[PDB]
Amino acid sequence: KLVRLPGLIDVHVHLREPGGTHKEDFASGTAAALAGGITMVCAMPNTRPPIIDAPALALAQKLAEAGARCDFALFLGASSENAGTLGTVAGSAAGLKLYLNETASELRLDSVVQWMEHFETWPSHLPIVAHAEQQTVAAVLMVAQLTQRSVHICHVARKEEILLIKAAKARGLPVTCEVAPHHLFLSHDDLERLGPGKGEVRPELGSRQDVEALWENMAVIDCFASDHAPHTLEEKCGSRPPPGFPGLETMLPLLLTAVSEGRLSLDDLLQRLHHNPRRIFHLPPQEDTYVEVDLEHEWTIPSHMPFSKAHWTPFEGQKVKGTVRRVVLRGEVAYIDGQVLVPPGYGQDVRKWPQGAVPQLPP
Amino acid sequence: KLVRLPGLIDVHVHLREPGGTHKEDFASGTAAALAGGITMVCAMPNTRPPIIDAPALALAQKLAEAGARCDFALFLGASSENAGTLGTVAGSAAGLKLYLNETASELRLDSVVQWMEHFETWPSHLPIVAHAEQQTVAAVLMVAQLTQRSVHICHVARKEEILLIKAAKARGLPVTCEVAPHHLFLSHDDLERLGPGKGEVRPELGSRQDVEALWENMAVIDCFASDHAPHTLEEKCGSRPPPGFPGLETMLPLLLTAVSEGRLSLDDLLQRLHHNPRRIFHLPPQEDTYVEVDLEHEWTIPSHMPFSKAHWTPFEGQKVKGTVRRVVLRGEVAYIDGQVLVPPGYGQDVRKWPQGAVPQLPP
Ligand SMILES: O=C1C[C@@H](C(=O)O)NC(=O)N1
Ligand SMILES: O=C1C[C@@H](C(=O)O)NC(=O)N1
Ligand SMILES: [Zn+2]
Ligand SMILES: [Zn+2]
Ligand SMILES: [Zn+2]
Ligand SMILES: [Zn+2]
Ligand SMILES: [Zn+2]
Ligand SMILES: [Zn+2]
Ligand SMILES: [Zn+2]
Ligand SMILES: [Zn+2]
Numbered sequence: 118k119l120v121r122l123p124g125l126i127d128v129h130v131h132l133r134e135p136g137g138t139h140k141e142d143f144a145s146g147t148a149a150a151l152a153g154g155i156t157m158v159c160a161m162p163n164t165r166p167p168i169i170d171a172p173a174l175a176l177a178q179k180l181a182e183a184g185a186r187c188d189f190a191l192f193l194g195a196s197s198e199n200a201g202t203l204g205t206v207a208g209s210a211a212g213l214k215l216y217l218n219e220t221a222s223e224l225r226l227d228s229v230v231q232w233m234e235h236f237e238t239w240p241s242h243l244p245i246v247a248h249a250e251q252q253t254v255a256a257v258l259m260v261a262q263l264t265q266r267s268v269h270i271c272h273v274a275r276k277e278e279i280l281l282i283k284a285a286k287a288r289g290l291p292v293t294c295e296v297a298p299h300h301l302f303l304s305h306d307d308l309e310r311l312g313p314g315k316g317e318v319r320p321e322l323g324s325r326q327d328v329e330a331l332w333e334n335m336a337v338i339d340c341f342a343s344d345h346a347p348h349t350l351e352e353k354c355g356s357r358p359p360p361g362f363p364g365l366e367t368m369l370p371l372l373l374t375a376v377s378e379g380r381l382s383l384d385d386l387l388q389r390l391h392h393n394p395r396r397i398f399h400l401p402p403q404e405d406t407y408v409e410v411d412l413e414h415e416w417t418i419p420s421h422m423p424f425s426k427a428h429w430t431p432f433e434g435q436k437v438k439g440t441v442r443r444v445v446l447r448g449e450v451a452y453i454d455g456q457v458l459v460p461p462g463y464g465q466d467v468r469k470w471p472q473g474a475v476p477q478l479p480p
Numbered sequence: 481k482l483v484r485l486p487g488l489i490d491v492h493v494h495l496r497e498p499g500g501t502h503k504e505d506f507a508s509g510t511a512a513a514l515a516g517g518i519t520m521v522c523a524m525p526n527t528r529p530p531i532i533d534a535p536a537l538a539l540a541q542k543l544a545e546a547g548a549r550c551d552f553a554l555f556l557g558a559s560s561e562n563a564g565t566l567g568t569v570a571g572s573a574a575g576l577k578l579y580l581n582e583t584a585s586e587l588r589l590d591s592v593v594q595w596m597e598h599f600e601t602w603p604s605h606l607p608i609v610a611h612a613e614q615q616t617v618a619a620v621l622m623v624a625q626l627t628q629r630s631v632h633i634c635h636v637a638r639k640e641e642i643l644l645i646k647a648a649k650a651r652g653l654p655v656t657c658e659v660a661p662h663h664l665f666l667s668h669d670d671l672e673r674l675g676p677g678k679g680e681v682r683p684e685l686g687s688r689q690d691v692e693a694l695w696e697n698m699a700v701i702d703c704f705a706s707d708h709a710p711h712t713l714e715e716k717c718g719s720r721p722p723p724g725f726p727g728l729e730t731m732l733p734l735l736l737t738a739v740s741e742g743r744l745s746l747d748d749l750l751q752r753l754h755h756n757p758r759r760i761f762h763l764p765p766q767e768d769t770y771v772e773v774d775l776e777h778e779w780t781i782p783s784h785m786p787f788s789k790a791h792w793t794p795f796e797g798q799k800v801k802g803t804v805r806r807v808v809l810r811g812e813v814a815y816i817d818g819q820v821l822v823p824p825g826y827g828q829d830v831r832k833w834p835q836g837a838v839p840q841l842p843p
Pocket of ligand 2: 494526611680681682683709710722723725829
């Protein structure tokens, strides 16, 4: 017998369109999402061109509306030039993304003062998420306190980071965070198998002690999110390997395996892939939407999953238990046993739904 | 201009039917809910007869389906006789309620061993909430740890209690809690005005220091919930005053006043009256459901609100800013400017909706 789950939400995916469509596009990345039991995705802005201004957002919105097979919201990206310019379009985005460590020149911020300017100008009711590693977590938390608002920390990967966030929560500070599956299910012990190119990811794979600290501190983790970051094998194995792993198709099977082993409960999983994503990002419900999983099916992850154009996976060879059998999205069968049955363009921008606007006080 | 809020959820109401219908019934109590911007309520089991067995739950379900004007779920109550007997009906309830301090003989538990028996036998995926004051909070937390599951603490009212829960959360323990408006907006300073009969409530009104501690520790409060506990003025002013305040019609106006004063944000309010109730109790979304409020309207709370049969209020004379103008419930206008426009029986048991079952692992 199957277990019915609600429509799961992945708040951190890179779908590569516009500009990197050999790595993934909206159609292939949302097929991967559906096959992973994900019915809503929030897409990051580090595309080509990057989503750092209103014209780029308008283009990305149309490409997503035409290509997405599941529902979505699109992040805006902070740049060294756009603070104070996004007010008209801010509410149409998933939130604002700050890249505070390595990134493309276009999203690079050169000074903490530029972080402050974004925290001061971005509407105070709308989400801000940050790629912030190691001491950068503490630094961006300080900026958030100076500007008296919340922040969400992307892909927490280290004991150091989860304990800092734990200490901030103990002081009542408004901070939430997410953890990606590779930081729960891979470690330095896997680098020999992966090799130095495939193994490149940011944040990097942690030690066994980092992984054990994230599990021990599950109560501190608000969301799981894949950081689906597809690149082709040629790129990962070449001379300048880009960081990132594909992850939409493997995230839920890995976590269902952990549920079956008693490492966390089904409820713990649903808080982190459904309820907390909804409440942190004010994402709306999806009517008549659910996912049926088979928790008894044992399988081994292959060298590539069927849908992502990345056409490789760092989880190859891992034994999992749990698999997505059927997905229904807004009353239509979207996925059954390896077949996606909704076309490109079936998905919608949830921020355009009446229930998908972030509530705010009047002017 | 009005602000659109989602359908708010009150996880702690006493609607008095069956058996106390001069105090309130499903029809009057859910009218009060709608007028307060509440579209879903969870009704407590200390009725007459109390909802402590399958026949009593079946009766209450039919009375609620026939009388409720907003959607609902019904709690089961723990008794000294029913542990291990509720398995067939448990999933149809909001959760299990434990009355661990004063209550009716029928819901009284005489030993902590009886609490353990309930924690051991009630299905582990379903909610347990407790009326647990002062050291009882620590005691029920110990039982929850011994049985390796979560607990939700009702109406936290004291500095002592919120700090204990804060310490438990810092240790990663699975505990959530709610706070009622009277413990945020009334104190010992109001007892002279209220008098000793009207002022009777459990948990009792706190000191100014208790109130200030709850506000200071807002980050620890997961939900607001009214503990709507209607009794008539004759009862409150008579020789054996029953404890409790009506609160559905005043909760949102009081909290909107606090939002307008910057004491908490609109988001803080919506986490506590919408998102966290959903996720702790696995309550489903309500399609095409929303509440429109006017945040600029100043008014003074009168001697009784229009709908509750309690026909009195302890907040009489308080100045508030914010008022419910319109409620839409599942596509129908349910309330406009003092008129309820859905009949008794419009409301439904959300636990019977496919999306309203609590997910669980198979047998
Ligand atoms: O910060 C990032 C971004 C991402 C990408 O490839 O877009 N991949 C990563 O590994 N880290
Ligand atoms: O515990 C309770 C229950 C309630 C009631 O009247 O049912 N009223 C109270 O004041 N405390
Ligand atoms: Zn990142
Ligand atoms: Zn993220
Ligand atoms: Zn990323
Ligand atoms: Zn929301
Ligand atoms: Zn109580
Ligand atoms: Zn309660
Ligand atoms: Zn109560
Ligand atoms: Zn749920």
